[PDB]
Structures are given as C-alpha cells and as structure tokens.
Amino acid sequence: ESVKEFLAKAKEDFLKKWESPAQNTAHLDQFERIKTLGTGSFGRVMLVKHKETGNHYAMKILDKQKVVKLKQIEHTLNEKRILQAVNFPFLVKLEFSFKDNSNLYMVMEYVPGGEMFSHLRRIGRFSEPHARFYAAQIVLTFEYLHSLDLIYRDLKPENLLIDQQGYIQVTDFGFAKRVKGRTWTLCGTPEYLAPEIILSKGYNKAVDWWALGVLIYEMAAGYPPFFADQPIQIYEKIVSGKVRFPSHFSSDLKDLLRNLLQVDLTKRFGNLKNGVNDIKNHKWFATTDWIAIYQRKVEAPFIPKFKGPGDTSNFDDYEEEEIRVSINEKCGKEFSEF
C-alpha cells in the first residue's frame, strides 16, 4: 500500500493548488515566438523562447471569442485549473498562464520528440512490447488522475508527446473535469468514444479505460478498432461493440482488449471491485515493472532523433499566423478566473 500512500499525498498537494490556482504568472512580451507546432479546432500551439532565461516552451493560444462561440468557456476554465494543479511524470507541466485583451495563453514544457500520432502513422504499427511500454504509462497516469476524481476524456495518439528519453507526456486537458458523480457531456474523439457516451447515458471514469483499449488496439494494429469515413458510421460500429483482432495479436493482448473494450460496465476492467489492479496484474502486463516505469528506469523502445535545442523536425509545418491582440478587452467577465 505504498501506491495508496503515494496517492494520499498526491491528493493533498493537488487540492491545495485546486483551491488556490496560480494566475497571471507571465506576459506575452516575455516570449519570442519561433514556430507553430500545431493548429486546429483545438487552438494553436507555438514554440516560444523565454527571453529572460532563454528556455524553450510550448505556448497554447486560445482566441477568447472563438472559445465563447464554441461554447467551451467552462471546459477551458477546467483545463487551466486542472493542469496547473496536477503533478505526475507523464503529464505535461504548465509553467505559466496569462491572458490579454484577445487571447488566453498556457505556456507548457516543450516536448521535442513530437506526437505519438506522427511516429505511429509513419512506422505503421508498434510491436506489442513497444505498445505495452506506452500503455503502462497511461495506466499509471489514469490511476493518478482518477484518484483525484479527474476524468480525462480525450485519450488518443494525437495527445501523447514523446520526450527526449522516449517516455510519454500527456497534453491537452480541454475535456478534463473534476467530478465525483456521473457526467453527461458528449465530448471526445469519435474513434475513442465509449458506448455509454454515444448513447447519452451519463457516464463516469470508466470511459477512460475504454479509451485505453482503443489506444492499445490502435498502437498494436496500426488502425483503430472502429473506423469509417464519417462519425455517424463510427458510432454505429462502437455501439455494436464487435471487435475483430489482427491475426498477429497475441492471445493475452486479445484477452486484455476484450475486457477493456467491454460494453458491460459490470465487467469492464478498471471499473470493477479490484480497480486498476485487474489491469496491472493482467497476463499481457506480466513482464511490466510498474515501479521502474514510474521512476523512468526502463529503457525506452524508441528514442526521438533530436539535433538542436529548439529543433522542430519532429513536428509538421503549418502556416504561420499573426497573434493579433485587439485594442479592447473581449469576454472579460467570462474568463475572469483564468
């Protein structure tokens, strides 16, 4: 019960930051903008250099007016409150946050190895030991998050960054939520949605363990267990729940996946009386040393190739856009707590 003891003290540290969140800890002028590392409906993430220390960071920029328009105000306040409060080896660190007239800014530690998504698509698929190495890190991270009553709700390779030592850093807490009961928001990514989300049932932390099943499948197969050209067709496949496995999947992997990709909440691993230990003690994880993983003592199966200090070869190229800061404050009352 030293996991039990680690988590008790983890919670005391989280709650102190949760109740008194850090706010307005830098300013845009302290950073020089270098390159856009990512951009989509989720916002825009730029490599920046902190002028006074020269440190490199990844700065997420959110347009306040666009957040309001997408009705993502509360989710955005969730994300910053939660991310500034957590502390775990596989969660990206939030170093500073601030806002100006037009934008919200979250300055995170820069993870130079790129997105797992990039390497997975290029390489095709990961071998089972390679996928097991990443999966173990997610299992420990969800154990940590869920003990704080946090639901993550957006696991996918696009949100997992690879650091210089080959370990995972989870990013994007846009859908993360602290909740003790059930919740109802339809959010996530189509391929990763648990059936109870699609069926508008009210759901809990068990949806994260379903998403882990999708991730492990996608890493080991090279494609997700439910895909189609349009989301409506993906949802139909998810709710029937019939998974076919590639012929090269081991017998243990298939058995773990049948228990994670389980429509019946009374049988889904992670959700039962034994909690996460049904997963940690499964046969597929028998060669996994959970303490060595946490301590980062396991040699990683893949090490990113990294040349410079702000080298960005592991990220795609995007059209650089201006960072326009209006002359008037926008949505002041909505984001007062940011």
């Binding site: 989720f42 989710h75 990514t189 391929e191």
Partner: peptide, 20 residues
C-alpha cells in the same frame, strides 16, 4: 485487408475532437 481499408479512408490524419 483492414489496413488497406484504413489507409484509403478519410480518417488517417489528425482527428478533431467533437463537443456537439
């Protein structure tokens, strides 16, 4: 093959979240 079907699909790039 399933792999061939995936690669020919429209969802091999980065996938956007839904918030519906």
């Amino acid at each position: 093959t399933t792999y061939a079907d995936f690669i020919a699909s429209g969802r091999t790039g980065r996938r956007n979240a839904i918030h519906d």
